[PDB]
Amino acid sequence: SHTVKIYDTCIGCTQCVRACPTDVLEMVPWDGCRAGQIASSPRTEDCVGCKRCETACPTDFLSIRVYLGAETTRSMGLAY
Amino acid sequence: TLSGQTPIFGGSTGGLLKKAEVEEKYAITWTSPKEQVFEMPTGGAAIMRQGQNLLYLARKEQCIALGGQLRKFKITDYKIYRIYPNGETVYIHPADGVFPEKVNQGREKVRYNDRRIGQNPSPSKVKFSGIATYDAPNS
Amino acid sequence: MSISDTQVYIALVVALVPGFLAWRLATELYK
Amino acid sequence: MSISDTQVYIALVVALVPGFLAWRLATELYK
Amino acid sequence: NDIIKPFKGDPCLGNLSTPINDSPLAKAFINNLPAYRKGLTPFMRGLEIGMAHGYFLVGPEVVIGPLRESAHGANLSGLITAIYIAVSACLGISIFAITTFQGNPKGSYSSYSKDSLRPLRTREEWSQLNGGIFLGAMGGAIFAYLLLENFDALDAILRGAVN
Amino acid sequence: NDIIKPFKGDPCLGNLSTPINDSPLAKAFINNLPAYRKGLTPFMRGLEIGMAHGYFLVGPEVVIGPLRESAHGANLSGLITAIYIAVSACLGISIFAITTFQGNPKGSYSSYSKDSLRPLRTREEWSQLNGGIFLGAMGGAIFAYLLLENFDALDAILRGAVN
Amino acid sequence: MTQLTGDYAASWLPWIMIPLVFYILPFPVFAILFLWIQKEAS
Amino acid sequence: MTQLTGDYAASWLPWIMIPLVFYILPFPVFAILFLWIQKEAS
Ligand code: CLA
Ligand code: CLA
Ligand code: CLA
Ligand code: CLA
Ligand code: CLA
Ligand SMILES: CC1=C(/C=C/C(C)=C/C=C/C(C)=C/C=C/C=C(C)/C=C/C=C(C)/C=C/C2=C(C)CCCC2(C)C)C(C)(C)CCC1
Ligand SMILES: CC1=C(/C=C/C(C)=C/C=C/C(C)=C/C=C/C=C(C)/C=C/C=C(C)/C=C/C2=C(C)CCCC2(C)C)C(C)(C)CCC1
Ligand SMILES: CC1=C(/C=C/C(C)=C/C=C/C(C)=C/C=C\C=C(C)\C=C\C=C(C)\C=C\C2=C(C)CCCC2(C)C)C(C)(C)CCC1
Ligand SMILES: CC1=C(/C=C/C(C)=C/C=C/C(C)=C/C=C\C=C(C)\C=C\C=C(C)\C=C\C2=C(C)CCCC2(C)C)C(C)(C)CCC1
Ligand SMILES: CC1=C(/C=C/C(C)=C/C=CC(/C)=C/C=C\C=C(C)\C=C/C=C(C)/C=C/C2=C(C)CCCC2(C)C)C(C)(C)CCC1
Ligand code: SF4
Ligand code: SF4
């Protein structure tokens, strides 16, 4: 149960969604970009916290923040 | 529901543990045109079948690790399910039937802040309040 | 002249007073 | 000169080899 | 063909069917240990487990303990070690039973757990186990204490010295 | 306001909610005594009750009994007192269980009794209790007997006299 | 000397309380303190 | 002599194995060998 907030500085480069190993992010239509897209995080209980989405965001001081919060059984990735 | 023939695999040690049938469990289901061999996300190698393939994995990251491997075999028809122990099977990937890199209609901006990240409020503003600085209904 | 045999036991029951007053306060701070 | 103290124990663990090879064969003949 | 199969035929399970866990001899030995023997009340599971352990636990303290130098005092130091190890062990499984069985045990003791390596999943079954483990490990400790403090009297009767 | 309430909010009940019976500490202590601990088989209720009593019952006879003058004989007189008190006590609760559980127990053991201060209302529950009380009060008596007849050997090892 | 003794008054009192607070009471204490950190909020 | 002894090496070994194979192990063995001759074919 992390918190992946997306800010208005996205450019719809789509790179944050590809890096996510757990499919937390996905693109929705938007208008504040030439791409007309913005990241959204509908599945954040699945967020593992790897911040691999933040490494891919190219906007300077990146538009997507993982906010490591209450860690549960699927946000810590336990197979046992 | 879910069905398919399991790949040729001699069984591993990295597979399902007691969390599989107690909390919940995942299943990736894909169709292959060829009888080739893929790397198991739980260590090892398995031979994927000719028709409908079914594989049980402990956590969702393994399924999308394997799903990202299937795209290197030019297979993009895989579906990831989530099996609760009581038995019902949810469809979770791809959630709308199209892959999340693609943009649909009807999807909603969820956890979107309509401000730059730079003007999140200071922690003193939300002092002794339920919210954090990053939800922050201002702007 | 060290303290007598009884003076040790007197301290034992006297120190039982802050022993329970600690329970007073630890539970009142809602453990 | 009788056999040493250790030579008895060496025979004990050596004879454990046909002790298990008898289990090999008795169960393989489907007891 | 291959002797190492997937564990009960499911390749996705995190185990292997190996000569150590899935052999006709190895299954016959483990599944008839008192922890797993079919047909035992949990008291008889713990009673037989307890006595096997109280018996051998007095050993390592009566010959390499601090009291080993004398004879009558060595046996006391070995018995009480088995008393203390077992009492603290049976304290462990009373508080294990309290803290795991609280409505829906998170793990291998859930109602839908289907686990064979630990079949005591009830808290009616873990309480007779505690009594068996305790009374067993106490009687085993005493029996190994009585046989050791009477060793000179017992060495004579297994040597024919008593005619 | 007032700290003394009607007993569980019913003014007509013949009791009071008082700091001695209805306190967070006092309820936590009494309701976790082995007589009342949630999650115990009746055997483990009696086993833990028994050992607490067999242990201390050997005391009042080995130092102010008739045999206190000597050493080896004092411990026998204290052990057998705990043997006799417990055997007659466990005789008492076998015949208590026979004579109260006879179809509709007149009193606090009726089916519609809803009494918390005595939860053993079955005669399947009072028979494991008898076994626990007996085997407990016997083991406690022996353990306090073994620790007392070996007191000189035990006084040395808690004083470092055994190096 | 070859024993633990006490010239101080009530010298019998370390004899029993050093075993008590150090290896007789803690395992009951660690059990009580264990039952408190692992109780359901139901 | 008035005792069973052994001049041979490891003379302690008959001391324990004559009781073992003759009156300590057989009743476990006759119990295991009993459970095998009286098992249901289900
Ligand atoms: C640090 C390690 C350590 C040390 C120092 C010891 C030290 C000792 N052990 Mg021990 N032991 C150990 C580890 C250790 N053990 C481990 C890891 C196990 C496996 C669980 C055992 C299992 C074991 C057994 C079974 C016995 C010992 C015994 C002894 C004592 C030997 C007494 C003797 O020589 O004459 C005396 C020898 C006898 C009196 C033998 C008489 C025959 C007995 C009654 C038969 C045993 C019961 C029988 C098998 C019941 C069947 C049950 C089932 C197995 C079929 C000695 C103090 C013996 C003992 O406790 O003395 C009372 C003994 O019987 N040990
Ligand atoms: C007429 C009244 C009377 C008399 C004459 C006695 C006389 C005696 N009592 Mg007793 N007692 C009484 C009433 C009486 N008691 C009452 C009303 C209670 C409350 C139930 C007790 C509880 C009690 C306990 C717990 C003990 C005694 C012990 C003794 C003996 C002292 C032995 C000694 O000095 O050195 C020897 C001292 C020791 C060997 C202490 C060693 C440490 C022990 C093993 C720790 C005790 C177990 C531990 C607390 C387990 C935890 C369980 C749980 C409480 C957490 C002595 C004969 C001791 C005894 O029985 O000796 C074996 C002893 O431990 N008494
Ligand atoms: C030969 C028969 C026999 C024997 C050896 C025993 C033995 C025993 N009984 Mg038992 N009992 C018996 C018959 C017997 N009983 C009968 C017929 C009844 C129904 C009334 C009972 C009801 C009973 C209860 C309710 C309890 C026992 C209990 C016990 C045990 C503890 C001792 C005791 O409390 O005395 C009690 C004995 C009685 C209340 C009745 C005894 C009457 C029989 C006929 C004995 C007569 C003996 C004879 C007069 C003297 C010969 C021996 C003497 C010379 C040494 C003990 C091993 C206790 C137990 O459960 O242990 C854990 C206990 O709670 N018994
Ligand atoms: C905090 C101060 C303090 C400290 C560090 C100690 C330390 C010690 N005492 Mg103690 N003691 C104290 C206060 C203290 N005492 C007071 C005020 C009394 C009068 C009743 C005693 C009476 C006493 C006796 C009779 C004995 C000791 C003994 C000992 C020694 C062994 C440990 C033990 O069994 O004690 C047992 C503890 C008590 C008897 C009660 C003391 C607890 C005090 C009152 C409060 C401590 C709680 C602390 C403030 C909270 C911190 C907890 C946590 C946050 C860390 C040890 C050096 C033993 C000894 O002599 O060694 C050879 C011995 O048998 N003391
Ligand atoms: C079949 C040959 C044979 C025979 C008839 C005996 C006979 C005897 N031996 Mg043994 N022994 C043997 C082989 C044999 N031995 C071998 C090869 C070793 C080397 C490990 C030993 C080591 C040994 C020791 C240390 C001791 C004996 C002792 C004894 C005597 C008491 C019984 C006993 O406890 O033995 C115990 C049995 C063993 C230690 C294992 C021997 C089993 C052999 C290896 C195979 C026998 C199985 C047989 C072939 C199958 C037939 C079963 C059925 C069909 C009838 C007894 C006279 C005791 C003694 O000295 O008496 C005073 C003693 O303590 N023996
Ligand atoms: C795995 C295996 C093995 C091992 C085994 C072991 C590990 C061992 C052991 C063992 C043991 C370890 C045994 C034991 C025992 C015991 C006993 C036998 C007991 C007892 C007891 C008793 C009898 C008691 C009684 C009593 C009581 C109860 C109370 C009162 C008191 C008295 C004392 C009376 C081998 C390799 C060899 C082979 C096979 C398999
Ligand atoms: C109320 C209260 C109190 C009190 C308490 C008391 C009253 C006490 C006590 C106590 C006691 C009183 C304790 C005890 C104990 C015990 C034990 C710990 C036991 C044991 C045992 C054993 C271990 C046994 C064993 C055996 C058997 C079983 C059989 C065989 C033989 C033998 C021996 C081995 C006070 C105020 C303080 C505080 C808190 C609360
Ligand atoms: C069945 C079986 C068994 C079992 C075992 C078991 C199952 C167990 C357990 C147990 C347990 C379950 C345990 C334990 C424990 C606990 C502990 C060890 C604790 C503690 C503590 C502490 C350390 C604490 C700390 C703290 C806290 C957290 C609070 C605050 C403060 C302080 C820091 C103090 C036996 C071997 C007997 C027998 C045979 C088989
Ligand atoms: C749980 C409990 C308990 C319990 C207790 C009880 C519950 C009891 C009881 C009991 C009982 C329940 C009893 C008793 C008794 C009886 C008697 C004591 C009797 C008698 C007798 C007589 C005296 C008689 C008389 C007569 C008659 C009536 C007939 C005619 C003739 C003549 C006159 C002889 C105990 C502490 C252990 C442990 C812990 C807790
Ligand atoms: C009665 C009697 C007696 C006895 C006595 C005794 C045996 C005792 C005891 C006991 C003791 C020896 C005690 C004590 C104590 C304790 C204390 C004093 C404590 C503490 C602590 C504290 C201070 C706390 C703290 C805290 C708080 C504040 C809150 C929360 C956290 C904590 C927990 C940290 C005699 C015979 C003498 C006399 C007569 C009768
Ligand atoms: S959050 Fe970053 S990676 Fe994702 S669309 Fe916006 S700018 Fe691109
Ligand atoms: S932290 Fe990892 S799982 Fe979570 S949104 Fe970022 S990339 Fe995806």
Technique employed here was cryo-EM
The closest of F29, F76, F87 to F54, measured between CA atoms, is F87
| Distance of CA H32 from the midpoint of ligand 5 (Å) | 21
- Measured between beta carbons, the chain H residues lying within 8 angstroms of E160 are 3-4
Four-point Cα dihedral B81, B82, B83, B89, nearest 10: -60
Q: A66 — phi, psi (to 5°)? A: -90, 130
CB pairs under 8 A between D and E: 3
Task: Tell me if chain C has a CB within 8 Å of the CB of F25.
Answer: yes
E67 contacts: CB under 8 Å, gap ≥ 6: E61, E73, E74, E76, E77, E78, F157, F162
| Distance of CA B46 from the midpoint of ligand 12 (Å) | 28
- DSSP-derived letter for residue E95 is H
Spatial distance between the Cα atoms of B3 and E56, rounded to a whole number of angstroms: 53
Does A33 show up as a binding residue in the annotation? no
Spatial distance between the Cα atoms of E108 and F102, rounded to a whole number of angstroms: 41
Spatial distance between the Cα atoms of B72 and G37, rounded to a whole number of angstroms: 48
Amino acid sitting at position C8: V
Spatial distance between the Cα atoms of E133 and E93, rounded to a whole number of angstroms: 9
F101 dihedral zone (left: phi>0; alpha: psi -120 to 50; beta): beta
Q: In the structure encoding, which two tokens stand for residue E133, read together?
A: 């483990």
Pairing label, strands B25-31, A64-67: unpaired
CA distances in angstroms from C6 to C1, C3, C13, listed in the order given: 14, 8, 11
**How many residues in total does chain A contain?**
80
Report the neighbours of F using a cutoff of 3 or more CB pairs below 8 angstroms: C, E, G
Spatial distance between the Cα atoms of E99 and E55, rounded to a whole number of angstroms: 29
Residue found by looking up tokens 């130091």 in the block: E77
Spatial distance between the Cα atoms of A79 and B131, rounded to a whole number of angstroms: 32
Ligand 3 pocket test, pick from F94, F128, F133 with the greatest ligand atom count within 8 Å of Cβ, gives: F94
The residue extents of the domains of chain A are: 1-80
CA E156, E159, E161, E162 dihedral sign is positive
Q: After which residues is chain D broken (C to N over 2.5 A)?
A: none
Task: Tell me if chain G has a CB within 8 Å of the CB of E98.
Answer: yes
What is the tally of helices (H) and strands (E) in chain E?
A: 6, 2
Resolution in A: 3.0
Report the Cα F40 to chain-centroid distance in Å.
Answer: 14
Task: Tell me if chain C has a CB within 8 Å of the CB of F14.
Answer: no
Question: Whole domain around residue H34: which residue ranges?
Answer: 1-42
Element (H, E) at B28: strand B25-31
Q: Which residue of chain H has the CA closest to D31?
A: H36
F53 contacts: CB under 8 Å, gap ≥ 6: F86, F136, F137, F140
| Three-class DSSP category at A64 | strand
Q: G30 — phi, psi (to 5°)? A: -70, -15
Spatial distance between the Cα atoms of A64 and B109, rounded to a whole number of angstroms: 13
HEC assignment per residue over chain F: CCCCEEHHHCCCCCCEECCCCCCHHHHHHHCCCCCCCCCCCHHHHHHHHHHHHHHHHCHHHHCCCCCCCCCHHHHHHHHHHHHHHHHHHHHHHHHHHHHHCCCCCCCCCCCCCCCCCCCCCCCCHHHHHHHHHHHHHHHHHHHHHHHHHCHHHHHHHCCCCCC
Q: In the structure encoding, which two tokens stand for residue F111, read together?
A: 């089916």
- Measured between beta carbons, the chain G residues lying within 8 angstroms of E103 are 40, 42
Spatial distance between the Cα atoms of B108 and A28, rounded to a whole number of angstroms: 6
- Are B22 and E113 in contact, with CB atoms under 8 Å apart? yes
- Are H4 and E155 in contact, with CB atoms under 8 Å apart? no
Establish whether residue E55 lines the binding site of ligand 6, counting it when its CB lies within 6 angstroms of any ligand atom: yes
Report the number of distinct structural domains present in chain G: 1
User: From the CA of E148, how many Å to the nearest CA of chain G?
Assistant: 26
Check whether the bond before B94 is cis (ω within 30° of 0): yes
**How many residues in total does chain G contain?**
42
Strands of the sheet with B25-31, listed across from one edge: B52-57, B25-31, B79-83, B89-93
User: From the CA of H21, how many Å to the nearest CA of chain E?
Assistant: 14
Q: In the structure encoding, which two tokens stand for residue G13, read together?
A: 């009192």
Four-point Cα dihedral E92, E94, E95, E97, nearest 10: 120
- Are E5 and E11 in contact, with CB atoms under 8 Å apart? no
What value does the CA radius of gyration of chain F take, rounded to a whole number of Å?
Answer: 21
Spatial distance between the Cα atoms of C6 and C14, rounded to a whole number of angstroms: 12
Kindly give the interhelix angle for E42-57 and E72-100, rounded to the nearest 10 degrees: 150
- Measured between beta carbons, the chain H residues lying within 8 angstroms of D8 are 9-10, 13
- Are F77 and F66 in contact, with CB atoms under 8 Å apart? yes
- Measured between beta carbons, the chain E residues lying within 8 angstroms of D23 are 25
Ligand 1 pocket test, pick from E48, E53, E56, E58 with the greatest ligand atom count within 8 Å of Cβ, gives: E56
Pairing label, strands A3-6, B79-83: unpaired
Q: In the structure encoding, which two tokens stand for residue E2, read together?
A: 């291959």
Spatial distance between the Cα atoms of B106 and E95, rounded to a whole number of angstroms: 53
| Distance of CA A2 from the midpoint of ligand 4 (Å) | 46
The closest of A26, A63, A29, A61 to A44, measured between CA atoms, is A26
The closest of F148, F34, F134, F150 to F84, measured between CA atoms, is F134
Q: What percentage of chain C's residues is helix, strand, coil (to nearest 5)?
A: 75, 0, 25
Spatial distance between the Cα atoms of B97 and B102, rounded to a whole number of angstroms: 11
- Are F154 and E72 in contact, with CB atoms under 8 Å apart? no
Question: Whole domain around residue B23: which residue ranges?
Answer: 1-139
Chains G and B touch, contact meaning at least 3 pairs of CB atoms under 8 angstroms apart: no
Chains E and C touch, contact meaning at least 3 pairs of CB atoms under 8 angstroms apart: no
- Measured between beta carbons, the chain F residues lying within 8 angstroms of G19 are 158
- Are B58 and B15 in contact, with CB atoms under 8 Å apart? yes
Q: In the structure encoding, which two tokens stand for residue A18, read together?
A: 């590809």
HEC assignment per residue over E27-87: HHHHCCCCCCCCCCCHHHHHHHHHHHHHHHHCHHHHCCCCCCCCCHHHHHHHHHHHHHHHH
The closest of B14, B92, B79 to B53, measured between CA atoms, is B79
Q: E17 — phi, psi (to 5°)? A: -85, 100
Classify each residue of A30-40 as buried b or exposed e, where b means 16 or more C-beta atoms within 10 Å of its C-beta: beeeeeebbbb
First-to-final CA distance of chain F: 62
- Bridge partners of E141, per DSSP, are none
Q: Where are the alpha helices (DSSP H) in A20-56?
A: 52-56
- Are E50 and E139 in contact, with CB atoms under 8 Å apart? yes
CA A28, A33, A39, A40 dihedral sign is negative
- Counting ligands in written order, the one closest to the CA of C21 is 10
| Three-class DSSP category at G41 | coil
- Are E55 and E141 in contact, with CB atoms under 8 Å apart? yes
Kindly give the interhelix angle for F125-149 and E125-149, rounded to the nearest 10 degrees: 30
CA distances in angstroms from E12 to B37, D25, F160, H38, listed in the order given: 16, 34, 58, 38
The closest of E127, E119, E136 to E49, measured between CA atoms, is E136
Kindly give the interhelix angle for F125-149 and F72-100, rounded to the nearest 10 degrees: 180
Spatial distance between the Cα atoms of F96 and F127, rounded to a whole number of angstroms: 10
Amino acid sitting at position H20: L
Spatial distance between the Cα atoms of A16 and A35, rounded to a whole number of angstroms: 14
Spatial distance between the Cα atoms of A28 and B27, rounded to a whole number of angstroms: 26
**How many residues in total does chain F contain?**
163
